[PDB]
Write an enzyme that holds these catalytic residues in place. Structure first.
Site, PDB file in Angstrom:
ATOM      1  N   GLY C  22     -30.145  25.907  36.310  1.00  0.00           N
ATOM      2  CA  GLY C  22     -28.821  26.101  35.765  1.00  0.00           C
ATOM      3  C   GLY C  22     -28.048  27.210  36.463  1.00  0.00           C
ATOM      4  O   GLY C  22     -28.503  27.850  37.403  1.00  0.00           O
ATOM      5  N   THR C  23     -26.831  27.405  35.978  1.00  0.00           N
ATOM      6  CA  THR C  23     -25.949  28.458  36.466  1.00  0.00           C
ATOM      7  C   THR C  23     -26.210  29.794  35.779  1.00  0.00           C
ATOM      8  O   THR C  23     -26.286  30.835  36.441  1.00  0.00           O
ATOM      9  CB  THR C  23     -24.492  28.031  36.275  1.00  0.00           C
ATOM     10  OG1 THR C  23     -24.353  27.377  35.012  1.00  0.00           O
ATOM     11  CG2 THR C  23     -24.094  27.072  37.388  1.00  0.00           C
ATOM     12  N   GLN C  26     -32.080  28.465  33.129  1.00  0.00           N
ATOM     13  CA  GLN C  26     -32.812  27.244  33.433  1.00  0.00           C
ATOM     14  C   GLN C  26     -32.520  26.199  32.358  1.00  0.00           C
ATOM     15  O   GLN C  26     -32.146  26.529  31.228  1.00  0.00           O
ATOM     16  CB  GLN C  26     -34.313  27.565  33.522  1.00  0.00           C
ATOM     17  CG  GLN C  26     -34.624  29.068  33.397  1.00  0.00           C
ATOM     18  CD  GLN C  26     -35.906  29.538  34.077  1.00  0.00           C
ATOM     19  OE1 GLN C  26     -36.351  30.667  33.848  1.00  0.00           O
ATOM     20  NE2 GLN C  26     -36.489  28.696  34.919  1.00  0.00           N
ATOM     21  N   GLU C 100     -27.742  16.866  23.847  1.00  0.00           N
ATOM     22  CA  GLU C 100     -28.469  15.610  23.859  1.00  0.00           C
ATOM     23  C   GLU C 100     -29.145  15.417  25.211  1.00  0.00           C
ATOM     24  O   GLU C 100     -28.767  16.015  26.218  1.00  0.00           O
ATOM     25  CB  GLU C 100     -27.527  14.455  23.548  1.00  0.00           C
ATOM     26  CG  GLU C 100     -26.175  14.552  24.220  1.00  0.00           C
ATOM     27  CD  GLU C 100     -25.234  13.473  23.748  1.00  0.00           C
ATOM     28  OE1 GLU C 100     -25.726  12.431  23.265  1.00  0.00           O
ATOM     29  OE2 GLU C 100     -24.006  13.661  23.858  1.00  0.00           O
ATOM     30  N   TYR C 101     -30.196  14.611  25.217  1.00  0.00           N
ATOM     31  CA  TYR C 101     -30.963  14.367  26.428  1.00  0.00           C
ATOM     32  C   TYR C 101     -30.475  13.073  27.077  1.00  0.00           C
ATOM     33  O   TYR C 101     -30.544  12.006  26.467  1.00  0.00           O
ATOM     34  CB  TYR C 101     -32.455  14.294  26.121  1.00  0.00           C
ATOM     35  CG  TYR C 101     -33.282  14.050  27.357  1.00  0.00           C
ATOM     36  CD1 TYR C 101     -33.469  15.065  28.287  1.00  0.00           C
ATOM     37  CD2 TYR C 101     -33.871  12.818  27.602  1.00  0.00           C
ATOM     38  CE1 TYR C 101     -34.228  14.861  29.426  1.00  0.00           C
ATOM     39  CE2 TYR C 101     -34.631  12.605  28.737  1.00  0.00           C
ATOM     40  CZ  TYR C 101     -34.806  13.625  29.642  1.00  0.00           C
ATOM     41  OH  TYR C 101     -35.562  13.398  30.771  1.00  0.00           O
ATOM     42  N   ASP C 103     -30.977  10.428  30.271  1.00  0.00           N
ATOM     43  CA  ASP C 103     -32.190  10.057  30.997  1.00  0.00           C
ATOM     44  C   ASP C 103     -32.093  10.406  32.485  1.00  0.00           C
ATOM     45  O   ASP C 103     -33.068  10.886  33.076  1.00  0.00           O
ATOM     46  CB  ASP C 103     -32.484   8.570  30.834  1.00  0.00           C
ATOM     47  CG  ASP C 103     -32.682   8.172  29.377  1.00  0.00           C
ATOM     48  OD1 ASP C 103     -32.762   9.067  28.510  1.00  0.00           O
ATOM     49  OD2 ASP C 103     -32.752   6.955  29.103  1.00  0.00           O
ATOM     50  N   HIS C 104     -30.936  10.161  33.121  1.00  0.00           N
ATOM     51  CA  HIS C 104     -30.794  10.366  34.563  1.00  0.00           C
ATOM     52  C   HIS C 104     -29.435  10.968  34.906  1.00  0.00           C
ATOM     53  O   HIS C 104     -28.500  10.944  34.100  1.00  0.00           O
ATOM     54  CB  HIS C 104     -30.955   9.055  35.352  1.00  0.00           C
ATOM     55  CG  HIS C 104     -32.263   8.360  35.136  1.00  0.00           C
ATOM     56  ND1 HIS C 104     -33.427   8.777  35.744  1.00  0.00           N
ATOM     57  CD2 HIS C 104     -32.594   7.282  34.382  1.00  0.00           C
ATOM     58  CE1 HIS C 104     -34.417   7.982  35.378  1.00  0.00           C
ATOM     59  NE2 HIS C 104     -33.940   7.070  34.550  1.00  0.00           N
ATOM     60  N   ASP C 145     -14.409  20.903  37.905  1.00  0.00           N
ATOM     61  CA  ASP C 145     -15.576  20.631  38.750  1.00  0.00           C
ATOM     62  C   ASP C 145     -16.180  19.264  38.426  1.00  0.00           C
ATOM     63  O   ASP C 145     -16.908  19.148  37.438  1.00  0.00           O
ATOM     64  CB  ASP C 145     -16.628  21.712  38.577  1.00  0.00           C
ATOM     65  CG  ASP C 145     -17.700  21.649  39.656  1.00  0.00           C
ATOM     66  OD1 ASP C 145     -17.444  21.076  40.733  1.00  0.00           O
ATOM     67  OD2 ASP C 145     -18.847  22.052  39.357  1.00  0.00           O
TER      68      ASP C 145
HETATM   69  C1  LIG Z   1     -25.664  18.568  34.113  1.00  0.00           C
HETATM   70  C2  LIG Z   1     -26.635  19.578  34.661  1.00  0.00           C
HETATM   71  C3  LIG Z   1     -27.919  18.973  35.238  1.00  0.00           C
HETATM   72  C4  LIG Z   1     -27.723  17.599  35.878  1.00  0.00           C
HETATM   73  O1  LIG Z   1     -28.898  17.210  36.593  1.00  0.00           O
HETATM   74  N1  LIG Z   1     -28.939  18.912  34.181  1.00  0.00           N
HETATM   75  C5  LIG Z   1     -28.938  18.111  33.091  1.00  0.00           C
HETATM   76  N2  LIG Z   1     -29.506  16.881  33.191  1.00  0.00           N
HETATM   77  C6  LIG Z   1     -29.574  16.068  32.116  1.00  0.00           C
HETATM   78  N3  LIG Z   1     -30.158  14.862  32.244  1.00  0.00           N
HETATM   79  C7  LIG Z   1     -30.496  14.267  33.523  1.00  0.00           C
HETATM   80  C8  LIG Z   1     -31.895  14.589  33.992  1.00  0.00           C
HETATM   81  C9  LIG Z   1     -32.122  15.450  35.053  1.00  0.00           C
HETATM   82  C10 LIG Z   1     -33.395  15.731  35.513  1.00  0.00           C
HETATM   83  C11 LIG Z   1     -34.498  15.128  34.938  1.00  0.00           C
HETATM   84  C12 LIG Z   1     -35.874  15.435  35.394  1.00  0.00           C
HETATM   85  C13 LIG Z   1     -36.143  16.337  36.413  1.00  0.00           C
HETATM   86  C14 LIG Z   1     -37.451  16.591  36.767  1.00  0.00           C
HETATM   87  C15 LIG Z   1     -38.462  15.960  36.098  1.00  0.00           C
HETATM   88  C16 LIG Z   1     -38.117  15.094  35.091  1.00  0.00           C
HETATM   89  N4  LIG Z   1     -36.858  14.819  34.722  1.00  0.00           N
HETATM   90  C17 LIG Z   1     -34.259  14.275  33.876  1.00  0.00           C
HETATM   91  F1  LIG Z   1     -35.323  13.681  33.284  1.00  0.00           F
HETATM   92  C18 LIG Z   1     -32.994  13.976  33.411  1.00  0.00           C
HETATM   93  C19 LIG Z   1     -28.976  16.498  30.914  1.00  0.00           C
HETATM   94  N5  LIG Z   1     -28.834  15.926  29.656  1.00  0.00           N
HETATM   95  C20 LIG Z   1     -28.191  16.838  28.963  1.00  0.00           C
HETATM   96  N6  LIG Z   1     -27.902  17.965  29.676  1.00  0.00           N
HETATM   97  C21 LIG Z   1     -27.206  19.135  29.147  1.00  0.00           C
HETATM   98  C22 LIG Z   1     -27.930  20.422  29.493  1.00  0.00           C
HETATM   99  C23 LIG Z   1     -25.746  19.173  29.591  1.00  0.00           C
HETATM  100  C24 LIG Z   1     -28.407  17.755  30.937  1.00  0.00           C
HETATM  101  N7  LIG Z   1     -28.353  18.597  31.977  1.00  0.00           N
END
Ligand SMILES: CC[C@H](CO)Nc1nc(NCc2ccc(-c3ccccn3)c(F)c2)c2ncn(C(C)C)c2n1
Lengths: 826, 248, 326
Positions: C22-23, C26, C100-101, C103-104, C145
């Site tokens: 993260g910025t 983590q 929320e989570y 997936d990609h 951004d």
């Molecule tokens: C946008 C910033 C970055 C983008 O990349 N991270 C991010 N990725 C999200 N979701 C996408 C994402 C990124 C990485 C994996 C990963 C990596 C290694 C091993 C297993 N999994 C993942 F399985 C899912 C996501 N879902 C919600 N958030 C919140 C914090 C805004 C998220 N933040």
């Protein structure tokens, strides 16, 4: 930063393309054979091939074609690399001196374009007026072959048909004309266009578009006597010229997909066709000339000649000789006879050229207690499947063990004096409701045999319908003797069970040595397998005993022994099992932060995980706590093909883009984030697809210190048969060898004038980076082959540096020694 | 989803401070001094009126959840302004805020900041954020005074007089507990109502519905005069208590 | 209640791993112990004490509690490390922003080469993206951004935006100085390359268009390392900035300073002639040099390409999870 060295132990062996012409002299008949990055030039004799020249190119050879423009005495060669490096080459021989001339060169890559599904296609006009290239969807690139285009400048014509299957320049047209098969939502069609160099656009095509077989695959340009084109499919062959339309649909070809074609008679009466099951056909253009003097194609006929190795490319040479270029098995020279033999075949093999085929897996084992090491590979596919025993001889000595089915994994079990090999064979749904194998193979020719009777998934109630003629994979565990390589035993897994992983080890306090196989239940409906088995076997007294089975909710892609415990990857999950005193597996702990845990490797209590898309992750078993911890992950995204651990801090990986990288722990505790951030300190474009990394060496016949500056041995196997080696360097040696590369690149002349630095640059469709942390040993080992004037030129003003001073200049006779020592690691 | 930030006047006798022994007059005196401290400090720096108000709404809410006797008010005030600056995108360095405070505070008063003023303030940010339940967005009477004034048509000079007098009443409301009792929209209408009664103007005529004597109901639904009268009473009390008089 | 943020402890989540760097902290993936919901936890460190709570996080909290749309990532709550509970001054603990989570991430899928987007897939993706941008642009907030890393997609085919770290409100009638360098160079509009500090909401549109081309090529359009080289690439395709098309280009700070090699002619339709007509028109308008002539989000949704897409269809993108293994 990290410093590593990469060399080729065995050059690529798979044939990627092959052409014939008059390239070395207007008089000789040549056979040019293309292996990945390697061009082999032969001359056609009455007995076989006389080799004359071999060159390497700093690129994967994508297009290879011979042509002879008006004014040339002999054929010129066109080659386009997969990174879009284009060149025109000439053979020149001054007595004993043979060299390759770069007549024209350039990079034809567009800033914007969508790479096509069917790949780069390159064709040349019969009047050698232009080179046609199909690089991107929706576009056709023309390089006009004028005398002044030494840079190979080119222009794009807009193509309405976005999805093109295949294209050829047709013969016998008033203007340059292309005939292609394309796919849109309404099916596949054959359409023709005319190309205008003056207007720089397409014009309406000579003959009508027709709509062809749904799986129309290849386009054949027919010689001027008949004119037109032939379209090869899965079920039918058709001829399209003007108003003329023919179609033959003989049932024999429906059985196996035809992949290669070649013209036997220049008039076009006879053509050769090959299919995936290794069959070789003759396509006959039965001619009826009309009374006015015109020649009409009356009918087409297909005749089966015999069997060859599953061929990537065919080329007919002369008399009854045909060169079979094979990517999946050994390449061949076969003679076609007018009379069939007593078995009905017209094909009789002459010579067999070794092809290590796809190296799916491999292991290093000291079979003779030589202290050395032998490499046992899982090589080839389908009827070409084999094991290969490889030992260093100056040449490599290779024993071949035919299997006639696909090998998947191999592991050595010393206690049993045998190997365990996972294999799969193709059976076809037959009228009984069961399946029938196309040919006998290792899993069917075992001395003793067994079949899993597991009831784990027997509850089913999930319907999977079967249609007659559909293929299925049948997976087996083969027990193979280490001296004779007799198949001692074969264990067939469940219907629709794929064997994906294999280990041989002892667990816990159990003194028995087991074969453990990880399986995944594959049903066509499932995007991701949802069922799987871990099976513990014991090979004892010529019989394989099922010891224990553990059901898992996924695919056991990879398994590795871990300090008496079993570490396995089940889809996303990474799990550690213990082996109880009751001889059953018990889960200790799990890790879930993975998309798909394709590859596993261990060292001590550390684990390296290769994900499908999230690159490498360093895991740790915290012994006190009994759980996994996350040391550090490579946040850069890569599609991984194989991974290896180099030392406690450096980790090696292979990309599906034919690239290699090295990740290291940042090892600076200013912030937890630096610790948890694996740093890609090595980037290298290999040019090969690495399937397996394996620690060992075959040159351990000396087994001695004071023979190498470099330390460590990681051997790897690739799809094109290439075997390589990765080893580490000290900062001092790398900076020396690196500085020497830059000097060598200025001195050594490249075929096609391809910059070496460009070739090794990390490359995906989305990125290009300069190489780092890697020494191209194959460049370093070419210092010995350059002429003396060039050698002394390389060492000019070269000051070697090391710890403890020693800032001194070195001579060329010094370096000849250094490189000679480096030629000994392999 | 989102928290309730409004209490009833009766509930303000059960602020933590009151129960620890602060009398109603003293808590309000403390409330004015802290708010005016926030206002004066931010004005001495270069801050938008919204930034000053945001700090004050924070400060006021804070001492509805904690007691003054344990949290020195000028430290709290400085912390609110520091955070408000980051929230409203008019940021200031904590050291610059502290310096401005020393210029404006007695040496006794700066004693609250203890031996390390910047630390006492920065440390409080954690508590401030948890106290305000991480609800950082705040709306203020100012935007509604202008949004509603824009929909009025009439003598420009008479309309401007109402706006300026009302704008003055809003600034004074920040010192009161009203920001904790009534939503900002109601306040904007209340200060308009007061300006109308004092300037002897009849606002309905400028509204689009001139016969609608309850002119505000076209801006703020469901507001009884009861509420507008209570608010006006509370605003003018500050003037009668102090030596200051209505702006007019 | 559900609204009392900052008090609940991070004990309530089983930490699965670290998904990203993260910025301000983590980013961890976690599972809620009570519900089983997979969440994404972003760590906020106020232990640095340089400026206390980072403004980047303050923006992401301030804005995402106000913005609610199916294409806007939802911040569910804010939780904390174990409390000392004796003296608040001693506490050096950190806060976590629950999201929320997803997936990609779009970059991940393109960089893994595991995705094939059909025209119909691009329609569903761009429609959600630009509908979300419209919600935000209607609320007068600017993303500032846009990148492939910042657009997350669930396997279900839902799209969400997740980079409000560099977001600020834009006032149409009242323009003020803004930070010049706001977007990753690859997705930065020409105005910000030439240094315009009073930027319109259309800076985000340029980026979203860069993505539209990227989905059709699978390769970013303007890949450069330096601000001048980027202007050159944009110019080779869109045309060189000149008063003929950008009347106010002379008002921008670096117009006399930053010239491309030539005064190029626009070739966008030629180099993208393999793209569908409805899409090419969307790209041509979104990749307009003059921000005052560049289309807005509402106009992009009322396009032949994105107007008549049924959001219910939600055709998932293509991922070859089993074929990839071999
Ligand atoms: C946008 C910033 C970055 C983008 O990349 N991270 C991010 N990725 C999200 N979701 C996408 C994402 C990124 C990485 C994996 C990963 C990596 C290694 C091993 C297993 N999994 C993942 F399985 C899912 C996501 N879902 C919600 N958030 C919140 C914090 C805004 C998220 N933040």
């Amino acid at each position: 930063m990290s410093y590593n060295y990469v060399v080729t132990a065995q050059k690529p062996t798979a044939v990627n393309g092959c052409v014939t012409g008059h390239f070395t002299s207007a008089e000789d008949l040549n056979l040019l054979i293309a292996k990945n990055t390697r061009l082999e030039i032969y001359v056609v004799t009455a007995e076989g091939l006389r080799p004359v020249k071999e060159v390497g190119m700093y690129g994967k050879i994508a297009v290879m074609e011979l042509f002879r423009p008006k004014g040339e005495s002999k054929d010129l060669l066109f080659i386009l690399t997969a990174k879009y490096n284009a060149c025109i080459l000439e053979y020149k021989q001054s007595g004993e001196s043979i060299d390759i001339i770069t007549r024209a060169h350039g990079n034809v890559q567009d800033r914007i374009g969508r790479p096509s599904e069917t790949g780069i296609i390159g064709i040349i006009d019969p009047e050698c007026r232009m080179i046609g290239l199909r690089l991107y969807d929706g576009l056709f690139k023309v390089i006009p072959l004028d005398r002044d285009n030494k840079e190979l400048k080119a222009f794009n014509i807009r193509l309405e048909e976005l999805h093109v299957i295949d294209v050829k320049f047709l013969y016998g047209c008033q203007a340059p004309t292309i005939c292609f098969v394309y796919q849109d939502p309404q099916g596949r069609h054959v359409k023709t266009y005319e190309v205008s160099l003056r207007e720089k656009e397409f014009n309406k095509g000579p003959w009508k578009q027709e709509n062809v077989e749904a799986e129309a695959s290849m386009v054949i340009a027919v010689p001027e006597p008949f004119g037109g084109a032939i379209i090869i499919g899965q079920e039918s062959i058709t001829y399209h010229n003007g108003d003329k339309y023919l179609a033959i649909a003989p049932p024999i070809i429906k059985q196996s997909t035809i992949v290669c074609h070649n013209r036997v008679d220049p008039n076009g009466s006879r053509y050769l066709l090959g299919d995936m099951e290794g069959r070789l056909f003759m396509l006959l253009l039965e001619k009826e000339e009309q009374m006015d003097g015109t020649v009409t194609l009356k009918d087409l006929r297909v005749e089966l000649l015999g069997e060859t190795s599953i061929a990537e490319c065919l080329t007919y040479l002369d008399n009854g000789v045909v060169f079979v270029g094979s990517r999946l098995g050994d390449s061949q020279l076969v003679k076609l006879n007018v009379d069939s033999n007593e078995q009905g075949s017209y094909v009789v093999a002459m010579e067999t050229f070794t092809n290590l085929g796809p190296i799916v897996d491999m292991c290093v084992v000291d079979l003779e207690r030589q202290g050395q090491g032998q490499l046992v590979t899982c090589s080839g596919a389908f009827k070409e499947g084999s094991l290969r025993i490889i030992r260093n001889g100056q040449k490599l000595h290779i024993r071949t063990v035919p299997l006639y089915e696909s090998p998947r994994k191999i592991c050595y079990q010393e206690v049993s004096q045998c190997f365990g090999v996972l294999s799969s064979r193709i059976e076809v749904q037959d009228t009984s409701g069961g399946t029938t194998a196309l040919r006998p193979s290792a899993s069917t020719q075992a001395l003793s045999s067994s079949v899993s009777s597991s009831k784990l998934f027997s509850s089913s109630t999930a319907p999977h319908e079967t249609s007659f003629g559909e293929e299925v994979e049948v997976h087996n565990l083969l027990i193979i003797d280490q001296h004779t390589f007799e198949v001692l035993h074969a264990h067939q897994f469940l219907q629709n069970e794929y064997a994906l992983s294999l280990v041989s080890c002892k667990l816990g306090k159990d003194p028995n040595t087991y074969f453990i196989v990880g399986t995944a239940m594959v049903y066509p409906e499932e995007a991701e397998p949802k069922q799987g088995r871990i099976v513990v076997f014991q090979y004892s007294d010529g019989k394989l005993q099922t010891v224990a089975e553990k059901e898992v909710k996924g695919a056991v892609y990879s398994m590795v022994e871990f300090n008496g415990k079993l570490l396995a990857s089940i889809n996303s999950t990474v799990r550690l099992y213990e082996w109880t005193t009751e001889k059953e597996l018990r889960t200790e702990c799990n890790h879930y932060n993975n998309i798909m845990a394709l590859y596993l490797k261990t060292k001590g209590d550390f684990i390296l995980v290769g994900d499908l898309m999230r690159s490498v992750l360093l895991l740790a078993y915290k012994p006190m706590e009994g759980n996994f911890e996350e040391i550090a992950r490579d946040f850069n995204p890569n599609w991984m093909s194989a991974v290896e651990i180099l030392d406690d801090d450096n980790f090696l990986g292979a990309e599906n883009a034919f690239n290699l990288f090295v990740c290291q722990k940042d090892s600076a505790a200013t912030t937890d984030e630096e610790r948890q951030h694996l740093q890609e300190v090595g980037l290298f474009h290999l040019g090969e697809f690495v399937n397996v990394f394996c620690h060992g060496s075959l040159v351990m016949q000396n087994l001695g210190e004071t023979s190498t500056p470099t330390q460590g041995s990681v051997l790897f196997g690739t799809v094109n048969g290439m075997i390589g080696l990765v080893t580490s360097l000290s900062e001092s040696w790398y900076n020396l060898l690196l500085d020497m590369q830059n000097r060598l690149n200025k001195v050594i002349k490249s075929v096609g004038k391809i910059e070496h630095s460009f070739w090794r640059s990390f490359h995906t469709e989305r990125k290009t980076e300069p190489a780092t942390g890697f020494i191209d040993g194959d460049l370093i080992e070419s210092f010995l082959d350059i002429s003396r004037p060039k050698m002394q030129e390389v060492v000019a003003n070269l000051q070697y540096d090391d710890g403890s001073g020693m800032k001194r200049e070195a001579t060329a006779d010094d370096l000849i020694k250094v490189v000679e020592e480096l030629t000994r690691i392999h | 989803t989102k928290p309730c930030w409004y209490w009833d006047k009766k509930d303000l006798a059960h602020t933590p401070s009151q129960l620890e022994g602060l009398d109603p007059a003293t808590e309000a005196r403390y409330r004015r001094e802290g708010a005016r401290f926030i206002f004066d400090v931010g004005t001495r720096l270069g801050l938008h009126y919204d930034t000053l108000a945001t700090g004050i709404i924070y400060f006021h809410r804070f001492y509805m959840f904690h007691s003054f006797k344990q949290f020195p008010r000028y430290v709290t005030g400085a912390c609110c302004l520091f955070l408000a600056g980051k929230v409203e995108e008019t940021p200031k360095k904590c050291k610059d805020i502290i310096k401005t405070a020393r210029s404006l505070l007695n040496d006794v008063q700066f004693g609250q900041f203890g031996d390390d003023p910047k630390e006492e303030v920065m440390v409080l940010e954690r508590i401030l954020l948890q106290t305000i339940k991480f609800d950082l967005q705040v709306e203020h009477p100012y935007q509604f005074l202008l949004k509603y004034a824009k929909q009025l048509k009439g003598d420009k000079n008479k309309i401007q007089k109402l706006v300026q007098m009302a704008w003055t009443f809003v600034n004074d409301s920040l010192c009161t507990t009203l920001s904790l009792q009534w939503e900002p929209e109601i306040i904007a209408v209340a200060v308009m109502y007061l300006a109308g009664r004092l300037c002897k103007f009849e606002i309905q005529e400028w509204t689009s519905k001139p016969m609608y004597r309850r002119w505000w109901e076209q801006f703020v639904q469901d507001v009884p005069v009861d509420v507008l009268e209570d608010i006006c009473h509370q605003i003018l009390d500050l003037y009668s208590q102090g030596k200051q008089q209505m702006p007019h | 209640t559900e609204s009392d943020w900052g008090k609940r402890c991070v004990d309530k989540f089983d930490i699965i791993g670290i998904i990203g760097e993260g910025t301000y902290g983590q980013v961890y993936k976690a599972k809620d112990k009570d519900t089983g919901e997979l969440v994404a936890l972003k760590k906020v460190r106020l232990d640095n004490e340089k400026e206390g709570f980072p403004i980047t996080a303050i923006r992401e909290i301030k804005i995402l509690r106000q913005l609610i749309h199916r294409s806007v990532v939802n911040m569910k709550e804010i939780v904390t490390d174990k409390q000392d509970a004796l003296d608040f001054k001693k506490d050096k603990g950190a806060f976590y922003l629950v999201f929320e989570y997803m997936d990609h991430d779009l970059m991940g899928l393109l960089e893994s080469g595991l995705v094939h987007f059909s025209e119909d897939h691009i329609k569903s993706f761009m429609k959600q993206l630009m509908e979300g941008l419209e919600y935000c642009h209607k609320k007068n907030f600017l993303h500032r951004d846009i990148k492939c890393s910042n657009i997350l997609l669930n396997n279900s085919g839902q799209i969400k935006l997740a980079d409000f770290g560099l977001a600020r409100l834009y006032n149409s009638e009242e323009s003020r100085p803004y930070t010049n360098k706001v977007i990753t160079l690859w997705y930065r509009p020409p105005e910000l390359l030439l240094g315009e500090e009073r930027y319109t909401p259309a800076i985000d549109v340029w980026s979203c268009g860069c993505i539209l081309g990227e989905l059709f090529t699978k390769k970013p359009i303007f890949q450069a390392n330096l601000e001048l080289a980027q202007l050159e690439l944009i110019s080779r395709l869109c045309g060189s900035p000149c008063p003929a098309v950008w009347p106010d280009v002379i008002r921008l700070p670096y117009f006399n300073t930053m010239k491309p090699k030539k005064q190029y002619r626009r070739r966008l339709r030629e180099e993208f002639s393999f793209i569908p007509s409805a899409a090419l028109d969307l790209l041509d308008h979104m990749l307009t040099l003059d921000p005052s002539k560049r289309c807005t989000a509402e106009q992009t949704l009322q396009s032949d390409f994105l107007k008549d897409v049924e959001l219910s269809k939600m055709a998932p993108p293509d991922l070859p999870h089993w074929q990839d293994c071999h």
